[PDB]
């Protein structure tokens, strides 16, 4: 990767850390429980880096 | 029996599709953020395009 562009990548989640991992521990635990009826998966971006 | 000589012309149709040239080394889809569009050569300098 390019170490200079990483701050913009990480902050905008173009190339970051897997939204299941950067959300606060409360939210991911919350969204996991209530995924059956009210799903929050498509709200947050989880990047893929080649 | 009467089979007057002929010449063959081939062709093809492709609708509802946009030609694609992925910006990757091997044209694959190893990730959303391509490997070539991540190298220092392209992400730390300005290049023209013709």
């Amino acid at each position: 990767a390019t170490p200079s562009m990483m701050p913009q990548w990480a902050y905008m989640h173009i190339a970051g850390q897997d939204a299941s991992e950067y959300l606060s521990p409360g939210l991911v635990q919350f969204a996991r429980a209530t995924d059956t009826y009210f799903s929050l998966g498509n709200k947050f971006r989880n990047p893929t880096v080649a | 029996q009467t089979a007057v000589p002929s010449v063959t012309q081939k062709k093809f149709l492709c609708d509802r599709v946009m030609w694609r040239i992925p910006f990757s080394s091997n044209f694959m889809s190893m990730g959303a953020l391509t490997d070539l569009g991540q190298n220092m050569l392209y992400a730390n300098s300005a290049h023209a395009l013709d």
């Binding site: 850390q17 897997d18 939204a19 991992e21 990047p47 893929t48 880096v49 | 190893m30 990730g31």
Partner: peptide, 28 residues
């Protein structure tokens, strides 16, 4: 880790998993 560095990173960790060494299928 040298072999594991060749896999796409879905976030931070690579995409390795689900060992699918197959090739048993025949007529049956």
């Amino acid at each position: 880790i040298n072999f594991a560095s060749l896999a796409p990173r879905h976030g931070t960790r690579p995409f390795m998993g689900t060992w699918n060494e197959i090739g048993t299928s025949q007529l049956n």
